[PDB]
Design an enzyme around this catalytic site. Structure first.
Site, PDB file in Angstrom:
ATOM      1  N   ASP A 197       0.832  -1.200   0.000  1.00 34.09           N
ATOM      2  CA  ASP A 197       0.000   0.000   0.000  1.00 34.09           C
ATOM      3  C   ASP A 197       0.870   1.254   0.000  1.00 34.09           C
ATOM      4  O   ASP A 197       1.934   1.268  -0.621  1.00 34.09           O
ATOM      5  CB  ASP A 197      -0.896  -0.020   1.243  1.00 34.09           C
ATOM      6  N   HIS A 206      -3.601   5.942   4.042  1.00 34.65           N
ATOM      7  CA  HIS A 206      -4.395   4.793   3.614  1.00 34.65           C
ATOM      8  C   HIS A 206      -3.748   3.459   4.033  1.00 34.65           C
ATOM      9  O   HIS A 206      -4.405   2.587   4.620  1.00 34.65           O
ATOM     10  CB  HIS A 206      -4.682   4.958   2.112  1.00 34.65           C
ATOM     11  N   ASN A 246     -13.846  -0.442  -6.084  1.00 31.19           N
ATOM     12  CA  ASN A 246     -14.888   0.461  -5.619  1.00 31.19           C
ATOM     13  C   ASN A 246     -15.697   1.097  -6.738  1.00 31.19           C
ATOM     14  O   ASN A 246     -16.081   2.257  -6.637  1.00 31.19           O
ATOM     15  CB  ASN A 246     -14.260   1.571  -4.772  1.00 31.19           C
ATOM     16  N   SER A 286     -10.916  -1.592   0.136  1.00 27.80           N
ATOM     17  CA  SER A 286      -9.599  -1.470   0.773  1.00 27.80           C
ATOM     18  C   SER A 286      -9.670  -1.702   2.287  1.00 27.80           C
ATOM     19  O   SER A 286      -8.673  -2.062   2.916  1.00 27.80           O
ATOM     20  CB  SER A 286      -9.048  -0.058   0.546  1.00 27.80           C
TER      21      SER A 286
END
Ligand SMILES: [Ca+2]
Length: 279
Positions: free
Chosen positions: A39, A69, A161, A224
């Site tokens: 990530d 994130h 998403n 996520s």
């Protein structure tokens, strides 16, 4: 073990019904397992990680998470308060820049890195990787995910998403890894969650409280966020000896809460990750 007033997602993964707020889990808590978070990085100094987090790789000028994130995802995997597997070792692999962007070649390198790097880590109960990223279909990205899995790492990846069929996204569309959709607090499919035959499982993904950079905390939403619930769950089950990296996704689907989610399109699995813990 019981953690009262837990984030709803943790409570959900240890419950046969929505609407409760205590997270129940075996005290072993993923001890002896490792989870790679591929990530934007991890703020390892966050008190919530308790010295159990470490950056092991970056492809950028810093290994710090300048986004948040990656830290949030890692928090859901294994932070003391917001994590599924509260005693796991967390390893950060920064394939995404501080804007959350990464070239597919860098993402691929990060995956192959983890496949080798696990041999440099102490993970007697097994190894997991959480991939909260994705882009359009790429056979090369899918293959890298397949290699990582094949090497003995339980690979969990976000469905995406787009409120679309995950077949058109990578690594989501790779059959050999665990593709994770998102649900909300009321057991509805998250409005943004991808779906399709390539999904293996759902996890909590809407309004998920976890760690953030600057030693803070944050609620955000996404596949996520669902992915690390599944990754942490795998680590927890592997420490318990219930499953292994090769079959953890299958085991999670096998033992999931079934047919309880709403707004699941015809043909998509109706399976919600569940730890089957009898306190
Ligand atoms: Ca599969």
């Amino acid at each position: 073990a019981a953690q009262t007033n837990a984030p709803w997602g943790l409570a959900r993964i240890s419950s046969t019904s929505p609407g409760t707020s205590t997270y129940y889990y075996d005290e072993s808590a993923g001890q002896g397992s490792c989870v790679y978070v591929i990530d934007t990085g991890i703020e390892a100094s966050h008190p919530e990680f308790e010295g159990r987090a470490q950056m092991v790789k970056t492809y950028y000028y810093s290994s710090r998470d300048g986004n948040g994130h990656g830290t949030h995802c890692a928090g859901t995997v294994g932070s003391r308060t917001y994590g599924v597997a509260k005693k796991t070792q967390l390893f950060g692999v920064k394939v995404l820049d501080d804007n959350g962007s990464g070239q597919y070649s860098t993402i691929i390198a990060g995956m192959d890195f983890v496949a080798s790097d696990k041999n440099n880590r102490n993970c007697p109960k097994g190894v997991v990787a959480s991939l909260s990223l994705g882009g359009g279909y790429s056979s090369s990205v899918n293959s890298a995910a397949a290699r990582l899995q094949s090497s003995g790492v339980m690979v969990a990846v976000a469905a995406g998403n787009n409120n679309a069929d995950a077949r058109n996204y990578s690594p989501a569309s790779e059959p050999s890894v665990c593709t994770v959709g998102a649900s909300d607090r009321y057991d509805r499919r998250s409005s943004f969650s991808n779906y399709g035959s390539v999904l293996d499982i759902f996890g909590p993904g809407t309004s998920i409280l976890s760690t953030w950079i600057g030693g803070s905390t944050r609620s955000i939403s996404g596949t996520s966020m669902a992915t690390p619930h599944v990754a942490g769950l795998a680590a927890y089950l592997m420490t318990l000896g219930k499953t292994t990296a090769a079959s953890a996704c299958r085991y999670i689907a096998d033992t999931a809460n079934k047919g309880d989610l709403s707004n699941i399109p015809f043909g998509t699995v109706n399976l919600l990750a569940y730890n089957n813990y009898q306190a």
